[PDB]
Design an enzyme around this catalytic site. Structure first.
Site, PDB file in Angstrom:
ATOM      1  N   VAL A  88     -34.241  19.780  30.019  1.00 44.20           N
ATOM      2  CA  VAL A  88     -34.161  21.021  29.233  1.00 44.20           C
ATOM      3  C   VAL A  88     -34.095  20.654  27.811  1.00 44.20           C
ATOM      4  O   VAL A  88     -33.254  19.804  27.428  1.00 44.20           O
ATOM      5  CB  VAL A  88     -32.936  21.900  29.634  1.00 44.20           C
ATOM      6  CG1 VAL A  88     -32.849  23.159  28.833  1.00 44.20           C
ATOM      7  CG2 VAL A  88     -32.992  22.221  31.145  1.00 44.20           C
TER       8      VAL A  88
ATOM      9  N   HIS B 218     -35.998  -5.815  31.985  1.00 47.05           N
ATOM     10  CA  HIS B 218     -36.653  -5.314  33.197  1.00 47.05           C
ATOM     11  C   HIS B 218     -37.078  -3.858  33.011  1.00 47.05           C
ATOM     12  O   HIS B 218     -37.832  -3.353  33.907  1.00 47.05           O
ATOM     13  CB  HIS B 218     -35.811  -5.554  34.448  1.00 47.05           C
ATOM     14  CG  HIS B 218     -34.721  -4.564  34.715  1.00 47.05           C
ATOM     15  ND1 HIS B 218     -33.416  -4.769  34.397  1.00 47.05           N
ATOM     16  CD2 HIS B 218     -34.758  -3.333  35.348  1.00 47.05           C
ATOM     17  CE1 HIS B 218     -32.675  -3.737  34.787  1.00 47.05           C
ATOM     18  NE2 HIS B 218     -33.517  -2.848  35.405  1.00 47.05           N
TER      19      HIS B 218
ATOM     20  N   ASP C 178     -31.669 -10.665  30.414  1.00 45.16           N
ATOM     21  CA  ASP C 178     -32.245  -9.320  30.650  1.00 45.16           C
ATOM     22  C   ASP C 178     -31.960  -8.397  29.488  1.00 45.16           C
ATOM     23  O   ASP C 178     -31.072  -7.501  29.535  1.00 45.16           O
ATOM     24  CB  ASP C 178     -31.717  -8.770  31.986  1.00 45.16           C
ATOM     25  CG  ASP C 178     -32.436  -7.522  32.400  1.00 45.16           C
ATOM     26  OD1 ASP C 178     -33.505  -7.193  31.841  1.00 45.16           O
ATOM     27  OD2 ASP C 178     -31.928  -6.833  33.371  1.00 45.16           O
TER      28      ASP C 178
ATOM     29  N   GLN D 147     -29.565   2.514  40.205  1.00 45.47           N
ATOM     30  CA  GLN D 147     -30.937   2.640  39.789  1.00 45.47           C
ATOM     31  C   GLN D 147     -31.104   3.870  38.868  1.00 45.47           C
ATOM     32  O   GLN D 147     -30.486   4.913  39.124  1.00 45.47           O
ATOM     33  CB  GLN D 147     -31.787   2.865  41.058  1.00 45.47           C
ATOM     34  CG  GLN D 147     -31.957   1.698  42.073  1.00 45.47           C
ATOM     35  CD  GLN D 147     -30.647   1.237  42.841  1.00 45.47           C
ATOM     36  OE1 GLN D 147     -29.997   0.286  42.516  1.00 45.47           O
ATOM     37  NE2 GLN D 147     -30.309   1.913  43.816  1.00 45.47           N
ATOM     38  N   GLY D 148     -31.821   3.685  37.760  1.00 45.09           N
ATOM     39  CA  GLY D 148     -32.046   4.643  36.686  1.00 45.09           C
ATOM     40  C   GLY D 148     -31.075   4.552  35.534  1.00 45.09           C
ATOM     41  O   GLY D 148     -31.312   5.096  34.464  1.00 45.09           O
TER      42      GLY D 148
ATOM     43  N   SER E 113     -30.322   1.492  34.486  1.00 46.35           N
ATOM     44  CA  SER E 113     -30.827   0.238  33.894  1.00 46.35           C
ATOM     45  C   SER E 113     -31.094   0.358  32.443  1.00 46.35           C
ATOM     46  O   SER E 113     -31.727   1.321  32.001  1.00 46.35           O
ATOM     47  CB  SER E 113     -32.302  -0.027  34.556  1.00 46.35           C
ATOM     48  OG  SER E 113     -32.245  -0.437  35.856  1.00 46.35           O
ATOM     49  N   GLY E 114     -30.704  -0.672  31.674  1.00 49.53           N
ATOM     50  CA  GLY E 114     -30.959  -0.691  30.277  1.00 49.53           C
ATOM     51  C   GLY E 114     -29.924   0.002  29.423  1.00 49.53           C
ATOM     52  O   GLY E 114     -29.910  -0.172  28.192  1.00 49.53           O
TER      53      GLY E 114
HETATM   54  N1  LIG Z   1     -24.954  -1.249  40.937  1.00 46.15           N
HETATM   55  C1  LIG Z   1     -25.448  -1.965  39.718  1.00 46.15           C
HETATM   56  C2  LIG Z   1     -26.924  -1.762  39.729  1.00 46.15           C
HETATM   57  C3  LIG Z   1     -27.529  -1.736  40.952  1.00 46.15           C
HETATM   58  C4  LIG Z   1     -28.862  -1.448  41.061  1.00 46.15           C
HETATM   59  C5  LIG Z   1     -29.557  -1.206  39.896  1.00 46.15           C
HETATM   60  C6  LIG Z   1     -28.979  -1.222  38.673  1.00 46.15           C
HETATM   61  C7  LIG Z   1     -27.625  -1.456  38.612  1.00 46.15           C
HETATM   62  C8  LIG Z   1     -29.944  -1.007  37.553  1.00 46.15           C
HETATM   63  C9  LIG Z   1     -31.183  -1.164  38.510  1.00 46.15           C
HETATM   64  O1  LIG Z   1     -30.912  -0.900  39.901  1.00 46.15           O
HETATM   65 CA   LIG Z   2     -32.752  17.720  26.701  1.00 46.64          CA
END
Ligand SMILES: NCc1ccc2c(c1)CCO2
Ligand SMILES: [Ca+2]
Length: 223
Positions: free
Chosen positions: A57, A40, A84, A174-175, A177-178
């Site tokens: 930085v 994703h 995923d 969120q952020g 991810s991956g």
């Molecule tokens: N709380 C796990 C989780 C929740 C939301 C999310 C992620 C992980 C990666 C994308 O957004």
């Molecule tokens: Ca840096």
């Protein structure tokens, strides 16, 4: 990461930032030419940023290397998030050193109760929004299959596991991810999804990397 701690600069040497003008996902360096992330996270125009602590930085240990190729898993389904996982090849080999280092792939699947390290530059608030500059860390256990399934009825496949705390307060977000979930020095998970962050009975869900090692190896061997 919600409810985590500042890792310390370059203490998670396999953690990369995927940048397309800005950080948008984590990833894990698995050899000098290849990074593991979430499907994703796919997009064109990725620059891989290794050796990062403060992503705003230039501190002196970074290596910035553009992707030459992205390979999303053959069976990725973006509605269910089954499978995923993706691989990203770097246009040049990274310089490996104490601060930029690959993480081993697992040779067996980890069990519920195993302790892991989850890391990333994602949101640090469960209500609200605050993005950190420096890398955050969280120690969290793998949760049982049954309790993962019970938390997310009809959503957990054999390619997913839950990790974290059913009481909430400590989770990926969120952020993140991956990015990596590392347990006993092996990459066992990839930050994949959940429902909000750090909520009660809604732990993080992670791609189960041990299921993908032979795809990863064969893909690298021919690409
Ligand atoms: N709380 C796990 C989780 C929740 C939301 C999310 C992620 C992980 C990666 C994308 O957004
Ligand atoms: Ca840096």
């Amino acid at each position: 990461i919600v409810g985590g701690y500042t890792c310390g600069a370059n203490t998670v040497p396999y953690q990369v930032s995927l940048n397309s003008g800005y950080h948008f996902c984590g990833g894990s360096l698995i050899n000098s030419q290849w990074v593991v992330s979430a499907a994703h996270c796919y997009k064109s125009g990725i620059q891989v940023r290794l050796g990062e602590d403060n992503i705003n930085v230039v501190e002196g240990n970074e290596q910035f290397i553009s992707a030459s190729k992205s390979i999303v898993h053959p069976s990725y389904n973006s509605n269910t998030l089954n499978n995923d996982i993706m691989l990203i090849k770097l246009k040049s080999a990274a310089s490996l050193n104490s601060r930029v280092a690959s993480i081993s792939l697992p040779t067996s699947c980890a069990s519920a109760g195993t302790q892991c390290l989850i890391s990333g530059w994602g949101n640090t608030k469960s209500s609200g929004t605050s993005y950190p500059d420096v890398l955050k860390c969280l120690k969290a256990p793998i949760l049982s299959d049954s309790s993962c399934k019970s938390a997310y009825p009809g959503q957990i496949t054999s390619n997913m596991f839950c990790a974290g705390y059913l009481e909430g307060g400590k989770d990926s977000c969120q952020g993140d991810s991956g990015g990596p979930v590392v347990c006993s020095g092996k990459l066992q998970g990839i930050v994949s999804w959940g429902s909000g962050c750090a909520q009660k009975n809604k732990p993080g869900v992670y791609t189960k990397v041990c299921n993908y090692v032979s795809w990863i190896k064969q893909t690298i061997a021919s690409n």
